[PDB]
């Protein structure tokens, strides 16, 4: 092979061990069989490279070809795209991923692959934040008086404001210990951060309010897929759909044995309605679309 | 509107030593690379460095590396560009620039109107 291979760079924050390191390596081997040895793929975890928006700006310079990030963090730099992580605008996967090939996702991908190079492949599920607290949760109701701590993001602040709780913004570190204690009542993140940091320990319920749910997507350095052959780009485009749906469901499934474990433990795990948080988060979805001039996050709702 | 004010243009010796400033407003300034372009009488713009958003890398056109130093302060809202052993090709209109990232495929989103430097000895 005279013309011999392409080696990519992928970079990542995540580690080896994680769903998304495990499915950066799957696809580093569906890419070298695929093309049968021509495209390699070198991967760079731990965040070796920098952070997310560190490695995006390499890709932006040809420097590095493959990276994760969230469709939601692109509202840093393409305002409108914030509307998809806004909390309950997103109903599921399957919607946030109609989002992102929707009208408005083809919009907010074509101005990422204009001004800043980056080309989106694929969204890529990567689960849904969930609620822990000292008591149960059945409806929007019992948030009010929650101590709910968040970490300071704005959405995961607004998520608890709008909701009727308490918001009490605590590093992650200090979480455990304000839950076994009770200065807090309940807090929120993914299923898996729930087990890893036995949350479930010091809090005797799960509220499945699904209230932000989360992807990563795929994204290639323009200058790098330009240079790339069509077959080359055909292999690549197929092999992230194939491990992104290998992705997406692994998160699933883990999910649903992580909310069955929950219930076998003793924890009593909650399902309340969930059209009264879509509706308490009117204010901030109308504060929204005011502050980008446009009807966005009603249509976005609607998908 | 973000808005960027270039100062210090001379004219100065060869070899003699230059800092131009560059006074930003309207935004979160950390969420902005800042550049230097400079753009001389019969060429085109062209870049000199640039800043990443918190100063941890920094990037420097080939012709000006090793002598030419990007900083910036986060708590004054500047960006500053020291040249040292001037050179009179280094003779141009200078023009501090932002952007959410550094480019090359395109031009920065923001300009200020820039400060002349002329260097002949």
């Known amino acids: 092979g005279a013309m011999g291979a392409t080696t990519l760079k992928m970079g990542m924050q995540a580690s080896v061990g994680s769903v998304e390191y495990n499915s950066a390596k799957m696809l580093a081997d569906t890419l070298e069989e695929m093309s049968q040895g021509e495209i390699k793929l070198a991967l760079y975890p731990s965040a070796q490279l920098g952070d997310d928006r560190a490695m995006l700006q390499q890709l932006t310079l040809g420097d590095l070809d493959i990276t994760y990030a969230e469709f939601g963090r692109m509202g840093l730099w393409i305002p409108r795209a914030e509307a998809v992580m806004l909390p309950y605008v997103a109903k599921d996967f399957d919607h946030l991923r109609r989002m992102f090939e929707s009208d408005f996702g083809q919009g907010v991908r074509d101005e990422m692959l204009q001004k800043f190079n980056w080309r989106a492949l694929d969204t890529w599920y990567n689960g849904t934040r969930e609620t822990t607290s000292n008591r149960p949760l059945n409806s929007i109701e019992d948030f009010k008086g929650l101590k709910l701590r968040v970490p300071n993001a704005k959405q995961n602040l607004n998520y608890a404001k709008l909701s009727g709780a308490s918001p009490t913004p605590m590093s992650f570190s200090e979480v455990y210990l304000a839950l076994q204690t009770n200065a807090v009542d309940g807090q929120e993140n993914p299923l898996p951060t729930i087990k890893t940091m036995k949350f479930y320990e010091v809090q005797k319920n799960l509220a499945m309010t699904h209230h932000i749910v989360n992807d990563q997507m795929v994204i290639i350095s323009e200058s790098t897929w330009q240079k790339l052959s069509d077959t080359d780009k055909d292999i690549i485009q197929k092999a992230v759909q194939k491990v992104g749906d290998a992705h997406t469901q692994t998160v699933k499934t883990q999910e649903a044995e992580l909310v069955s474990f929950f219930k076998s433990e003793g924890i009593n795990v909650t399902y309340p309605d969930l059209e009264p948080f879509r509706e308490a988060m009117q204010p901030l979805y109308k504060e929204f679309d005011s502050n980008i001039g446009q009807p966005i996050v009603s249509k976005l709702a609607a998908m | 509107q973000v808005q960027l004010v270039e100062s210090g243009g001379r004219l100065v010796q060869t070899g003699g030593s230059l800092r131009l400033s560059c006074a930003a407003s309207?935004?979160?300034?950390?969420?902005?690379?800042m550049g230097w372009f400079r753009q001389a009488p019969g060429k085109e713009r062209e870049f000199v460095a640039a800043?990443?958003?918190?100063?941890?890398?920094?990037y420097y056109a080939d012709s000006v590396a090793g002598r030419f130093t990007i900083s910036r302060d986060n708590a004054k809202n500047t960006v500053a560009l020291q040249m040292n052993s001037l050179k009179p090709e280094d003779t141009a209109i200078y023009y501090c620039?932002?952007?959410?990232?550094?480019?090359?495929?395109?031009?920065?989103?923001?300009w200020g109107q820039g400060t002349q430097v002329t260097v002949s000895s």
């Open positions: 800043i990443s958003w918190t100063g941890a890398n920094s």
């Open positions: 309207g935004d979160t300034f950390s969420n902005y690379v």
């Open positions: 620039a932002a952007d959410h990232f550094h480019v090359t495929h395109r031009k920065y989103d923001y």
